[PDB]
Design a binder for this molecule. Structure first.
Ligand SMILES: [Ca+2]
Ligand SMILES: [Ca+2]
Ligand SMILES: [Cl-]
Length: 192
């Protein structure tokens, strides 16, 4: 049983994302005692929730912290507040029903090639994982760049107002300079 970092990728991303790979390589070099779990998330929110529950069951006997990017940050917030886990959320989607609206219909993940159909019922499924009000804001750290061209940064800054925040002017949705924050991330998550 080791401490574990759980990384949650964004919608239509994958575990081979640049951020996930950079963190996995850095963690293996500097903190090999912290294992990294990076699941391939189903596109269907109800099924993502069930998979994440099984991961928390498996890893909950040891320190466990979550990092999530974009929609992965929305899932990380739900895990944080439902399972009392610390989480760092990176350019998170806080109104994901608007985010996923333009993924309705048939889709193919550009990383993995998986084909899937997103239906309106899936968006309603995502809404049930919405946390409002935040009951344990001390468990969350928002990392946000104002230059995010996909999401309006102001939504996250307001939603996470009672949490630790690092808001950087400029940047983009992919989050520039993610690696500059890695030691502070492991410290916030209680894994160091
Ligand atoms: Ca573990
Ligand atoms: Ca579309
Ligand atoms: Cl996303």
């Amino acid at each position: 049983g080791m401490a574990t970092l759980l990384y949650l990728h964004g919608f239509n991303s994958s575990p081979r994302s640049a951020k996930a790979t950079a963190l996995k390589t850095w963690l293996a070099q500097h903190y090999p005692e912290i294992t990294m779990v990076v699941p391939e998330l189903p596109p269907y929110p109800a099924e993502t929730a069930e998979l994440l529950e099984s991961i928390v069951l498996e890893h909950g006997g040891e320190p466990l912290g979550v990092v999530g990017s974009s929609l992965g940050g929305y899932y990380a917030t739900w895990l944080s507040q439902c399972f009392m886990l610390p989480a760092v959320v990176v350019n998170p989607a806080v109104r994901p029903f608007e985010l996923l609206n333009n993924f309705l219909g048939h889709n193919e993940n550009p990383y993995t090639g998986q084909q899937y159909v997103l239906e309106s019922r899936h968006i309603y499924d995502l809404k049930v994982m919405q946390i409002d009000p935040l009951e344990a804001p001390d468990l969350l750290w928002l990392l946000q760049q104002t230059g995010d061209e996909v999401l309006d940064y102001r939504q996250a800054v307001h939603y996470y107002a009672s949490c630790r925040q690092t808001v950087e002017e400029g940047g983009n949705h992919a989050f520039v300079g993610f690696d500059d924050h890695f030691t502070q991330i492991i410290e916030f998550l209680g894994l160091r």
